[PDB]
Design a protein around this ligand. Structure first.
Ligand SMILES: Nc1ccc(C(=O)O)cc1
Ligand SMILES: Nc1ccc(C(=O)O)cc1
Ligand SMILES: Nc1ccc(C(=O)O)cc1
Ligand SMILES: Nc1ccc(C(=O)O)cc1
Ligand SMILES: Nc1ccc(C(=O)O)cc1
Ligand SMILES: Nc1ccc(C(=O)O)cc1
Ligand SMILES: Nc1ccc(C(=O)O)cc1
Ligand SMILES: Nc1ccc(C(=O)O)cc1
Ligand SMILES: [Fe+3]
Ligand SMILES: [Fe+3]
Ligand SMILES: [Fe+3]
Ligand SMILES: [Fe+3]
Lengths: 81, 305, 491, 102, 81, 491, 305, 102
């Protein structure tokens, strides 16, 4: 269990989403979208990506949060390519 | 014919004032409609008994002015401000009563003072009630509402004084139950010589039905006499007898009495706009002063006994 | 410490004495005192049941005004004037005009007692009574005054009693008869007992209920506060009544009550009746006029009258029938001759209102409804000339109000006439004629508006001449339909 | 006149309280101080008509308790807009009552 | 000029109507109707008649008010046969 | 005769003396007094510009309450509760809950000054200040109390500050920081100057304008009367400010003002912003939130700040942008997580309202409108599960409010983070992070709701567990949509 | 889990009372949220400076009770009723000032009384301000709102007394401009021996930061001493020197002082529900009484000079 | 920030009067006691914002005249809900003013 704070593209806030130490930037992006898409954000085409908050670099879609070196409660964004 | 007109900022009768109408102007001025029709003051048969009464005792008074309604209470008191003012004065007097009772004031007066109070003070309730009745008469007969309003407040002040006297008579009797306090006042008012000048004065005054004579006798003659010959000597006697409450109480009553004299003088000034009124007023004063002086001498003689 | 009022109160009213330098009769003349020969000593039994004293009075009354004025101040921006039904505005105009300076007149009724009553307790309570009526006159000038700048008809809050306008004459003929024109004991019985425990509850509390429904809290709060004073000083009447009965004067007492109640009824029927059943918006009618009558006059007042030892008035049955009928006709008269009023009568006969009226007064549509049918038609056809009068109504020589009956299907109207000292007088009921006959010197040389018109006192002898005579000072002041006839559109 | 007869033949006594802070406390006081009397209340928004058969008492002590602040009996006048019955008042209570039974 | 007070059948009040000393109970009835019919009373068929107020007897349609012995300001009704 | 206040007033504040039996520092410890080393003698220059004295105070304040209470009494039957828009009722619930016991806390701010300020005039004016806040706390408990019997959410007028509910924690973290948690001089500057001349005008007068439009005069009259006291005791701040500047402490003064204004802004944006632009019925919006800000904060307050000799806050431009944006997002957060509120948020996004919002905030529909579009859809399709949260929002470590940004077309959101003593903290602006860094000992070991949740203090770790932790005591108390979603029907 | 519940007739915390909640209950009870969390009184870092202050000087006080909040002002005063009461008392005092000035009271005091007033009365403004500061401290530290409210009113009363003194100091100087009235009070408070016991007492009292010790020292020790050793002797001296105003003024101030003692005694009764508190309270009284007695002796010695 | 700049750069001073009996009299008083100053009034129903450039004086004497009843300056506090400018008050008048000109 790994708590993070996630800002989903086009939403209005940052939320606490609890992911797992072994999830990939595809699974994390999915867990975040759950609390956003079809709630305050319209669903769309494209691939959901994860980056450290306001970072220029995206995490590889396959990397786990463990491999990412993120610390718990650190902030991330979820955007579209 | 008729014209279309703008709304006025105040009553039609005040619309020509060159100053914004005050609370006093708005609620006090020109309210006696009974002065509109000389032939028939009241909206009844023109010769109904009350119409004849008013035509004789108001309209036909020798005290004459073409615009009584222009009279102004120099204090410009209205009901609302009267109660504010008097709740202030009366709360203070009641606080004095409470405080002096707490400190057992009455026990410390000079020996025998209780008898002087029972004879000279307590029967004042009759005198003050006479002032109350008389003030009400002037109220109902005066030719302008601004005059009548002063009389209404004065009637209330008279009851105020009456009430002070009743309260203190009773209170004093709690310390001095063997002096006749609250028991023999009517007999004193009726039989005691010192009271007979005053009683004769008021009985006759209460039968002066002309509004002008009523006003002059009451406010220019009787009431100032009471200030100078009753209120102030009582204060002096109280001082000589270690009564420290009465002088304070009377100072509060004297505030009312100066107010009555203040509006009275202002009415006189208004009336004297008519040069004819000087002789009228002067005549009524001369007529009543001897009775007033005799009432005062008898009272003072009794106070000093 | 302070001593309780019960321990010193008797001394405040121990003020009767035996006159020696003038006679008892000179000091209390019958024409002003009305003691009916009852000696001074008997009057000391008088015991006012609603007491107060000077220190409590000024303190309490200060608190009463602080609330009345604070509420007015906090609600100045509620836009009652702009946003209220104009029928409601006319209710305010009518009330203030018919009442403010009458209140001030009532000071003189109280003063008559304060000076001339032989009962010491009555003289003291009348002193607070003088103060109360002063309050009431000043409140009811102060409150409408702010509306002068909006509407000239509000000037009548002050002007009405100074005019010869018909409702002002009706008001003064009544008040001058029971308030300012009679002896102290008559005032105690006719004013404080009959009028003030009898009818004022209707206008000051019944109307307040409608005002609260209308959302006019400044006004409801005002008049209901005013009536708290009435509740106290009106209690000078009962003990005078009881004293007269104990001293063998029950017939005299009964006749005064009978007279005053009927006189009050006719006036209330022409002012309060139309207000409650027509001017007040339908959704704001807490109860009908009749329902309020049954609450306040029958259920409360008449029951109290019986409890004190008096009888139902001889005219009881006529009164009950009148409650069903009179004001409907008075309303119609006030509205048809609306141009002589200082307020704007609402016709109050939209279909929705006629349904309510039929429910509250079964058979209404077959009666007054017949006339309103004709009226409504002329309006829907722009024959506005047929909706304004070209003559005078016949006016009662007692109440100063038009002579009316039941119109329509079962038409019935009766005038009760009287020759007296060579003059012909006309009354709208047996009771009004009876009142005249009780005291002709009071009434015989009075001339009503019609009399004056026929005697040549109103010139020119035309509608405009009469309006001028009545004291109107501009076009705006003259009464019109409250809704500019917009009610016709619901028809 | 059967309606009118029924209206007249009542023995209802009690205060009419104008809208304000005394309405609820007076009703509660009427109920408490007259146990085994049925208290009736007619609500006209601008005032409330509170009644009992024959007699209705309001004590200063109960009214003060129900109002929730210090209260002298004479203050009731601030809100007593009218009343049915004859009145008997003092520093401790007010009593509304009839001498007759109709 | 002769003032009377007139109550017209089915109306709600009595009004002052000024007629002439020489008018007949047809003319008087006409002058009254003027201030009533088509104002508060519906027009109808029939003959308008004049009687002393609440009287059982009707005045002849041809009699003048002078001949009738009526005094000014006395009350009359106007009804239909 | 009486002698005028100007002739004896100096003696009322001639109360400073030179301690001999304890030291000056023992008598006025820096942690409680905050004199910044300025010697006693310099503080006697302090001159309160809005004076009063004890006799005037009790008399005037008696009059203030008489009006407040009289008005409440006269309007009890206006059926505000039953007849008002439920958005308006929620505005009352929010106000009373967030304010009443906070007012009572402000007594302690004033007391801190009354005891510990070195300025004698400040100690006397703070004494009236203690009294004023006592009035305000008691008024704002007394008024809503009558509604307890109608609605359990009104219990929060008393309960809120005793709970760990999120808005209560936000309110206490702010008030405990600027009112009860700092030295006397800090209170003078942060509370009486910054918060009280700066923002309270918005909530107590801006909202009163909306209340008057809504026809709730009891409430408008109440809060506007309350602010008359503020106008006087708030004037303790300016002269402390001027004295600090004269004595070389301008930087310290500027920083305190800067800190307090921003802290106040974030809280006002989450409570007053949604009230003015969403809860208050559209027809009752006297001005928009931004417009009121420009009137009260920019036009009045910031101009006064400059007049006294201070500078615009360094964060001026961020503040202006925030005025355009922040509260729209705060509203959305309060509403989405409405179940954790003690009032019932109104969504306030009917087509008519969105038009107003677009006019008041051009580009709104392309931003917040995008989210409300999604929300509105779920409601029109009974997917109510998507309109209730299944996680926590990320919460600021300063203001205790969710971390937000601009949604929609030009999405932009920024969190400002900080490692401190091994712990990671998150702030919703540069200014909030700056505030923390100004005084870490004040804040560092505080834990917000999210922190507590992650530390295992909230059990069970579910929506219900959190609601229990927040002090809710029944289903009724939990916040819901004000109109039960009926607004969707306009869509 | 959660339940659906009816609205309560009053606040949830008062809902179990077997009496209808009064105005006092509604607006006064259980308003200090700062007592809810022992670890962190205020909603900040638990070890912030003010949190540490409160944990030491309130929470850790040896004066202990499990339910301080249950304390009740025996007078049940709220802001609204305090102002009604004090507007009454203060209007009365101001009326006395006005009336006695009108009658030139000050001119008639015994020769030299002005000097006794300048030395023994006017510097009271410092003493009363100390009481004011101290009352505010007890307010901010007390563990229950019902206690703090009593302290707030007491702080206001202290300013009331301060204000009386300032007014009369100035007024007296108008008749006696050569006695140092309104000029030398600070020096007297600082240097005059008769004032040094009092000044030492208050300086030390103001540095007693434990809420319980603050309360006991102020309300149980210092304030009753002032009543018996300052207020009442002053009245006696005034009587001996034909000052009739001061005794009346002091009687009004004594009403406030008895009220403070009345609520103080009630708090003590509440605290003594815990038998442990008897020794605590008794110890603080013994600790402070000697300073209080010395302050009184020095003052009285000076008054009699 | 041009809107914000324009809002800040004002010299408006004067009372904000809460709805009640002082609104009209204060506006009239502002006009009378500051001749040759333009008085601006913004009406928000619950309060009115009354202003002049640089300085705005209200004298007790004029306010008493415009209010129409006896009035002491300290009573203005009953209705002075806020104010722009610094304040200088005494028994004869209140002055609202700025030290700077923006
Ligand atoms: N009271 C009356 C007033 C006026 C007239 C009249 O003008 O004839 C008659 C009586
Ligand atoms: N118009 C009136 C109004 C009131 C009264 C009264 O209270 O006696 C009398 C007349
Ligand atoms: N009650 C009246 C109504 C109207 C008229 C009239 O128009 O002359 C006279 C009296
Ligand atoms: N020609 C006239 C018509 C009508 C009236 C009137 O209604 O008073 C008076 C004269
Ligand atoms: N919630 C609060 C309300 C008001 C005040 C204040 O006036 O200082 C402070 C806090
Ligand atoms: N500001 C906040 C809003 C909501 C929550 C929550 O639901 O836990 C916490 C904080
Ligand atoms: N599982 C949870 C979902 C939501 C919340 C919350 O909003 O506080 C808490 C726990
Ligand atoms: N002020 C605070 C209150 C509570 C907590 C916590 O529960 O961890 C932390 C800080
Ligand atoms: Fe009246
Ligand atoms: Fe009356
Ligand atoms: Fe406050
Ligand atoms: Fe404040």
């Amino acid at each position: 269990a790994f708590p993070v704070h996630a800002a989903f593209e086009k939403d209005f806030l940052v939320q606490l989403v609890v992911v797992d130490l072994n999830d990939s930037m595809d699974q994390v992006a999915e867990k975040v979208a759950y609390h956003c898409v079809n709630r305050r954000v319209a669903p769309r085409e494209g691939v959901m990506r994860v980056r450290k908050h306001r970072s220029t670099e995206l995490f590889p879609r396959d990397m786990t949060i463990a491999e990412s070196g993120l610390n718990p409660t650190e902030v991330i964004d979820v955007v579209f390519e | 014919s008729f014209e279309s007109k703008k709304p006025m900022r105040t009553w039609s009768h005040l619309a020509e004032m060159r100053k914004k109408p005050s609370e006093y102007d708005i609620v006090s001025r020109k309210l006696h409609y009974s002065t509109n029709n000389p032939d028939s003051p009241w909206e009844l048969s023109p010769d109904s008994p009350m119409n004849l009464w008013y035509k004789q005792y108001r309209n036909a008074s020798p005290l004459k002015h073409d615009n009584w309604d222009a009279f102004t209470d120099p204090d410009q008191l209205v009901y609302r401000t009267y109660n504010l003012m008097q709740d202030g004065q009366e709360s203070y007097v009641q606080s004095l009563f409470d405080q002096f009772n707490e400190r057992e004031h009455d026990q410390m007066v000079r020996e025998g003072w209780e008898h002087t109070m029972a004879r000279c003070y307590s029967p004042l309730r009759y005198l003050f009630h006479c002032l109350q009745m008389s003030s009400a008469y002037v109220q109902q007969m005066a030719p302008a509402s601004t005059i009548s309003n002063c009389c209404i407040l004065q009637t209330a002040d008279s009851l105020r004084w009456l009430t002070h006297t009743a309260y203190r008579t009773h209170e004093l009797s709690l310390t001095y139950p063997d002096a006749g306090l609250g028991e023999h006042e009517r007999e004193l008012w009726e039989k005691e010589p010192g009271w007979q000048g005053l009683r004769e004065l008021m009985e006759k005054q209460l039968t002066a039905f002309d509004w002008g004579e009523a006003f002059v006798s009451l406010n220019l003659v009787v009431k100032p006499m009471i200030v100078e010959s009753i209120f102030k000597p009582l204060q002096q006697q109280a001082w000589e007898n270690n009564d420290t409450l009465l002088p304070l109480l009377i100072d509060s009553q004297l505030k009312d009495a100066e107010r009555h004299s203040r509006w009275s003088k202002a009415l006189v000034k208004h009336a004297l706009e008519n040069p004819d009124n000087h002789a009228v007023i002067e005549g009524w004063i001369e007529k009543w002063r001897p009775l007033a002086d005799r009432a005062a001498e008898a009272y003072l003689s009794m106070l000093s006994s | 410490a302070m001593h309780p009022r019960k321990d010193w109160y008797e001394l405040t009213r121990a003020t009767n004495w035996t006159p020696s330098y003038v006679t008892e009769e000179q000091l209390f003349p019958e024409r002003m005192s009305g003691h009916m020969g009852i000696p001074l000593e008997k009057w000391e039994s008088y015991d006012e049941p609603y007491k107060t004293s000077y220190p409590e009075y000024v303190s309490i009354q200060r608190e009463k005004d602080a609330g009345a004025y604070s509420v007015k101040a906090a609600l100045e921006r509620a836009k009652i004037y702009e946003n209220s039904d104009p029928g409601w505005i006319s209710t305010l105009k009518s009330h203030y005009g018919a009442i403010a300076v009458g209140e001030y007149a009532a000071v003189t009724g109280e003063g008559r007692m304060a000076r001339f009553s032989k009962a010491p307790g009555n003289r003291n309570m009348a002193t607070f009574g003088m103060m109360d009526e002063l309050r009431h006159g000043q409140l009811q000038l102060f409150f409408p005054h702010e509306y002068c700048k909006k509407d000239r008809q509000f000037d009548w809050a002050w002007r009405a009693y100074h005019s010869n306008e018909w409702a002002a004459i009706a008001a003064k003929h009544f008040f001058d008869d029971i308030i300012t024109g009679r002896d102290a004991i008559s005032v105690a019985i006719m004013l404080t007992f009959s009028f003030e425990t009898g009818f004022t509850n209707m206008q000051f509390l019944g109307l307040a209920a409608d005002a609260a429904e209308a959302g006019d809290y400044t006004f409801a709060n005002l008049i209901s506060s005013i009536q708290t004073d009435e509740s106290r000083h009106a209690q000078q009447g009962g003990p005078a009544l009881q004293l007269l009965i104990e001293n063998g004067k029950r017939e005299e007492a009964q006749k005064k009550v009978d007279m005053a109640i009927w006189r009050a009824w006719r006036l209330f029927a022409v002012l309060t009746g139309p207000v409650m059943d027509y001017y007040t918006p339908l959704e704001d009618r807490s109860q009908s006029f009749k329902e309020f009558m049954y609450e306040w006059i029958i259920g409360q007042f008449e029951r109290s009258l019986i409890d004190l030892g008096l009888d139902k008035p001889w005219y009881w049955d006529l009164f009950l029938k009148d409650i069903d009928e009179l004001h409907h006709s008075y309303h119609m008269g006030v509205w048809y001759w609306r141009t002589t009023a200082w307020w704007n009568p609402a016709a109050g006969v939209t279909p929705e209102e006629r349904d309510w009226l039929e429910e509250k007064y079964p058979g209404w549509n077959k009666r007054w409804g017949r006339c309103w049918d004709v009226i409504t038609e002329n309006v829907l056809n722009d024959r506005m000339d047929l909706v304004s009068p070209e003559t005078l109504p016949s006016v009662c020589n007692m109440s100063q109000i038009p002579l009316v009956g039941v119109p329509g299907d079962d038409w019935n109207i009766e005038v009760f006439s009287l020759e007296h000292n060579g003059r012909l007088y006309h009354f709208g009921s047996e009771v009004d004629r009876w009142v005249f006959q009780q005291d002709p010197v009071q009434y015989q040389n009075h001339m009503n508006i019609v009399d004056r018109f026929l005697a040549g006192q109103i010139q020119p002898m035309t509608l405009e001449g009469a309006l001028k005579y009545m004291g109107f000072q501009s076009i705006e002041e003259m009464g019109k339909d409250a809704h500019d006839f917009a009610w016709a559109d619901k028809c | 006149s059967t309606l009118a007869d029924q209206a007249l033949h009542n023995n209802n006594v009690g205060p009419i309280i104008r809208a304000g802070d005394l309405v609820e406390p007076v009703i509660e006081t009427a109920e408490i101080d007259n146990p085994g009397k049925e208290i009736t209340v007619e609500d006209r928004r601008a005032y409330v008509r509170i009644a009992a058969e024959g007699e209705l008492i309001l004590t200063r002590k109960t009214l003060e308790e129900q109002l929730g602040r210090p209260f002298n009996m004479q203050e009731l006048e601030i809100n007593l807009a009218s009343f049915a019955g004859q009145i008997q008042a003092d520093e401790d209570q007010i009593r509304f009552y009839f001498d007759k039974t109709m």
